[PDB]
Amino acid sequence: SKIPIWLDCDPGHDDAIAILLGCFHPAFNLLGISTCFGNAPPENTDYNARSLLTAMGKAQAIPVYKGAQRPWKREPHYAPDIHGISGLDGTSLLPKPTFEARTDKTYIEAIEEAILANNGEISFVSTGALTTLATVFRCKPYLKKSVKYISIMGGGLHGLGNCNPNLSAEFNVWIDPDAANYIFRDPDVKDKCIVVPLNLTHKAIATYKVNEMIYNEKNNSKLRELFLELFQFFAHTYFESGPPIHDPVASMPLLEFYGWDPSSAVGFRYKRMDISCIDDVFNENSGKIIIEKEYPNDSDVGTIIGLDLNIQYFWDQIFEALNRADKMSTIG
Ligand SMILES: [Ca+2]
């Protein structure tokens, strides 16, 4: 009756909105969160996640584990330019977290539980690196055939990117190309992977119209203010229309595929392709996506590559979630 999910993220301004959806959208049973390295160091992305949940009141519902703390191979390089030093700069409203990251078990064990608990029905959602999920599947490969979908925000098609000398690579793939390949090339997994690339996410712009919706004379919670202050800082690091909010877009295909709403509503269109990426770090196009193969639209084989969705609908979902979050705000 409700889409069970695990979220691996690196908050992260756009990742904060991913958490908001998974916590508060009526369609999602969030089973837990794993934080990886990426936008900031792993200690920051951990704290940032637990701070958000504490602000939204969800710090005693949503289990938090520390995920992958570093890439498989490459030296960790973070993004201070876009996200700041804490990885979530621009808002002082973020409260000191009530709860610790849980240590009853490894994150691999926690994800193992969650998958088996929702055997065949769960979807894993990576808004950060693919290191967390690639490690789970290395260590516990039996778990592959239990996950229904893996919804990834990452990659860019046709040499679209925000990383590497040529801007040919997208961040989440670039920070661990090995982990990405291990996912994209595995025949068990690649066929049920959903990829939401820069091509698609760059449609998810937070314009003046969107900011009005988050904060206005009718609706001016401090929680609402927090989320506004994120959108603003994200925009300051840019698209004159405003900044794209990449990570929540990975939730939309699930709403269509699990059939929360009709495809007419969600409007999620996609292709079927095998993909890989350049994982030689010394390569100038390090991380750039290669399209290995392409398939007819009725194909079962191939990674599911997002092309278009209804951006109106996207935003309606975020606002829906935000009105419920507002009721559970712990910071005024
Ligand atoms: Ca992210």
UniProtKB/TrEMBL annotation:
Keyword set includes Protein biosynthesis: no
Domain named Inosine/uridine-preferring nucleoside hydrolase: residues: 5-316
Keyword hit for Hydrolase: yes
Superkingdom classification of source: Eukaryota
InterPro entries, per the entry: I/U_nuclsd_hydro_CS, Inosine/uridine_hydrolase_dom, IUNH, Ribo_hydro-like
Family: Belongs to the IUNH family.
Name of the protein in question: Uridine ribohydrolase
